[PDB]
Amino acid sequence: PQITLWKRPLVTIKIGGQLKEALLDTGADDTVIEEMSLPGRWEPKMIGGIGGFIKVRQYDQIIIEIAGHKAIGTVLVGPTPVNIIGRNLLTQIGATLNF
Amino acid sequence: PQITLWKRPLVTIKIGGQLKEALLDTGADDTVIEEMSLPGRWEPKMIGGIGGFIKVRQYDQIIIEIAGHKAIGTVLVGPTPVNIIGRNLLTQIGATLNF
Ligand SMILES: CCCC[C@H](NC(=O)[C@H](C)NC(=O)[C@H](CCC(=O)O)NC(=O)[C@H](Cc1ccccc1)NC[C@H](CC(C)C)NC(=O)[C@@H](NC(=O)[C@@H](N)CCCNC(N)=[NH2+])C(C)C)C(N)=O
């Protein structure tokens, strides 16, 4: 897929058997998903963004399918206004920005 | 160019008469620049992201050259942690997201 940017780049993902919508974000180092139950151990972390810092639960080596492509890596879960797929996962599906 | 996502995608931009380094942010609807005295009128605006909102000043019709690509649109100036080139300007340089 060659995704143009006139609209927000929304993609369907499947995490924990659950389908959700997420924004492919090249300005995010990591991947933060809204509060949900995820099987596994998780370590408490803090990340920051434009408005400041938020507390998240950190899950390692989670299997996640982004637009059909699979990836296995870290997923942070917490109070984000929107689900974001960061660079840690976008590199796994071989996404690049072009112009 | 084709930008890979192993590292933050940073490019040099030109606003007003100065050179800067900005991050191409596919998950930013808007463009927000670090604090700087740009001549011209503006309106107060509130912008949010992860963690909350920040107050910014809004300038319209500003010309920015990004990666040797001139565009023109609204720029928001405020105490942002990084210069962020959003979709309002990315669509003007014809940038796509491909995986
Ligand atoms: C391996 C870990 C690395 C270290 C780790 N990294 C970070 O914290 C880095 C700097 N932060 C990030 O990468 C975070 C996302 C979270 C994350 O990836 O962890 N990135 C971000 O927050 C980037 C911008 C940025 C980049 C780098 C630094 C700071 C800021 N923006 C992400 C964000 C996504 C959006 C859909 C909410 N976009 C925005 O914030 C833009 N906002 C918008 O476009 C709004 N119009 C959206 C709606 C707002 N309102 C609402 N939802 N009710 C803004 C630039 C105008 C850490 N914790 O220190």
Distance, CA of B80 to CA of A2 (rounded, Å)? 30
CB A32 within 8 A of CB A84: yes
Distance, CA of A14 to CA of B50 (rounded, Å)? 22
DSSP A87: H
Q: Kindly state the tokens that stand for B14.
A: 């030109």
Q: Report which protein residue has its CA nearest ligand 1's atom 3.
A: A29
Largest distance between two CA atoms of chain B: 41
Residue type, B3: I
Contacts of B37 (CB under 8 A, 6+ apart): none
CB A16 within 8 A of CB A77: no
Interface of B with A (CB under 8 A): 1-6, 8-9, 23-29, 32, 47-54, 67, 69, 80-82, 84, 87, 90-91, 93-99
What is the DSSP track for B63-91? EEEETTEEEEEEEEEE--SS-EE-HHHHT
Chains A, B: CB contacts under 8 A, how many?
Answer: 135
Distance, CA of A35 to CA of A57 (rounded, Å)? 9
Contacts of A25 (CB under 8 A, 6+ apart): A9, A84, A85, A86, B25, B26, B27
Distance, CA of B60 to CA of A34 (rounded, Å)? 33
* Nearest chain A residue to B46, by CA: A51
First to last CA, chain A: 15
Specify the CATH number for the domain of residue A35: 2.40.70.10
Residue B40 CB-density burial (10 A; 0-12 exposed, 13-18 middle, 19+ buried): exposed
In chain A, residues with a C-beta closer than 8 Å to the C-beta of B45 are none
CB B13 within 8 A of CB B86: no
Enumerate the β-bridge partners of residue A60.
Answer: none
What are the start-end ranges of the H helices in chain A?
87-90
Interface of A with B (CB under 8 A): 1-6, 8-9, 23-29, 32, 47-54, 67, 69, 80-81, 84, 87, 90-91, 93-99
Tabulate helix, strand, coil % of chain A (nearest 5): 5, 55, 45
First to last CA, chain B: 15
Q: Kindly state the tokens that stand for A95.
A: 């996404």
Instruction: Give whole-number Cα distances, A94 to A19, A69, A71, B80, B94, in Å.
Output: 21, 10, 10, 29, 20
* Among B24, B8, B7, CA closest to B64: B24
Three-state secondary structure call for residue A20 = strand
Q: Kindly state the tokens that stand for B1.
A: 């160019």
CB contact under 8 A, B5 and A81: no
Ligand 1 within 6 A of CB of A86:
yes
Active site residue A25: yes
Distance, CA of A76 to CA of A60 (rounded, Å)? 9
Contacts of A68 (CB under 8 A, 6+ apart): none
* Nearest chain B residue to A66, by CA: B99
Distance, CA of A64 to CA of A97 (rounded, Å)? 21
CB A31 within 8 A of CB B32: no
* Among A95, A87, A85, A93, CA closest to A68: A93
Which range marks the domain in which residue A64 is found? 1-99
Q: A43-48 and B2-4: which strand pairing?
A: unpaired
Residue B43 CB-density burial (10 A; 0-12 exposed, 13-18 middle, 19+ buried): exposed
* Among A62, A26, A64, A48, CA closest to B6: A26
When divided into structural domains, chain B yields a total of: 1
